[PDB]
From Swiss-Prot, chains A, B:
Constant region of immunoglobulin heavy chains. Immunoglobulins, also known as antibodies, are membrane-bound or secreted glycoproteins produced by B lymphocytes. In the recognition phase of humoral immunity, the membrane-bound immunoglobulins serve as receptors which, upon binding of a specific antigen, trigger the clonal expansion and differentiation of B lymphocytes into immunoglobulins-secreting plasma cells. Secreted immunoglobulins mediate the effector phase of humoral immunity, which results in the elimination of bound antigens. It comes from the Eukaryota. The basic structural unit of both sIgE and mIgE molecules consists of two identical heavy chains and two identical light chains; disulfide-linked. N-terminal variable regions of the heavy and light chains form the antigen binding sites, whereas the C-terminal constant regions of the heavy chains interact with immune receptors to mediate effector functions. Glycans are attached at N36, N48, N59. Residues 1-102, 108-207 form the Ig-like domain. Disulfide bonds join C23-C83, C129-C189. This is Immunoglobulin heavy constant epsilon. The chain holds residues 217 to 424 of 546 of the full protein.
Length: 208, 208
């Protein structure tokens, strides 16, 4: 029985302009009672209506999440939100809180590229992107075929990792068909991040 | 209070030829009693002497690990080892087990490269490597300046991530000085993995 609270994704915060935070509760072994999640603002101000999702996987996880729409300005100004998790059997209630990260800011550096695909085949052509030197750690990464964005499910992005002083880096891998591999020059890796002024967005086409 | 048991690193198993497994126990809040770790072989056979390490970080973690030297052949043949963790306050003892992963095998594909370093500076030149299409997920990655291996602490490697059917991929980043950046053609990314016959090793120099 664990719980996690995540900050808004930069994409939802700066592009979409409709930030949300999510409280995720994982129950390795389900005993039946209801799992409650309560939201509150440290400032005492009112919180909006949240969305609850319950999903079972007979593997060993009754996943439960609650997504709370957050004010854009309030979040940027530092409001702190709290998720109070109430599971039937446990003594004390779980409590998680989140706020914007403070500290210095640094823009992301983006580098997209293709992996050598030397004939004689059994395959998977791959495009990949390295995004680095950014801080804080929150960032949204997305692939585009020119001006149109591809579904998220198509790429795999690693978790932000610290480095030597610089800040953070993330790596994204995108497997593509032979067809789109012929127009790889048209694929673009885009990063959305707070420190990337103007418009918190930085992108680069696959170098060839 | 959590526990983790890891399999041997491919490097220790195939190059060094002296495999070890490690039981790591993390105690977020220390109450003082002793933390015991007991090793056993599912086959009942004798286990060697293990090495115990205790380290404190007033942050909130009394880390404790026990490393057990493992037989090369026994491990390759499928022996299963168990770590029985005994902490003072908890009711039942924690138990973790590990064995070689079964299933299909696939060699790693290695691609090393340098990130564009366009003048006008405040910096960090970087070399990076993408290793993919391998399975099982255990792999050792290392950087070398020609024939000599660099200290591990110098690079950062992501955790193996699944993909679409293919298998796994891992990304490694290596920040270098302006000096070594002049001889980047000499840096090599090497992967040690079971399916990479001959000698379970595959490497590639930084493409330029």
């Amino acid at each position: 029985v664990s719980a996690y609270l995540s900050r808004p994704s930069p994409f939802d915060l700066f592009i979409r302009k409709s930030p949300t935070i999510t409280c995720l509760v994982v129950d390795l072994a389900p005993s039946k009672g209801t799992v409650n999640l309560t939201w509150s603002r440290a400032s005492g101000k009112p919180v909006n209506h949240s969305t609850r999702k319950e999903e079972k996987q007979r593997n060993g996880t009754l996943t439960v999440t609650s997504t709370l729409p957050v004010g854009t300005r309030d979040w940027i100004e530092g409001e702190t939100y709290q998720c109070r998790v109430t599971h039937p059997h446990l003594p004390r209630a779980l409590m998680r809180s989140t706020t914007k990260t403070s500290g210095p800011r640094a823009a992301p550096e983006v580098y997209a590229f293709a992996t050598p695909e030397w004939p004689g085949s059994r395959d998977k052509r791959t495009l990949a992107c390295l995004i680095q030197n950014f801080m804080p750690e929150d960032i949204s990464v997305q692939w585009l075929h020119n001006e149109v964005q591809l579904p998220d499910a198509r790429h795999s992005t690693t978790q932000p990792r610290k480095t030597k002083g610089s800040g953070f880096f993330v790596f994204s891998r995108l497997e593509v068909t032979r067809a789109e591999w012929e127009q790889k020059d048209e694929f673009i890796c885009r990063a959305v991040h707070e420190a990337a002024s103007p418009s918190q967005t930085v992108q680069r086409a696959v170098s060839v």
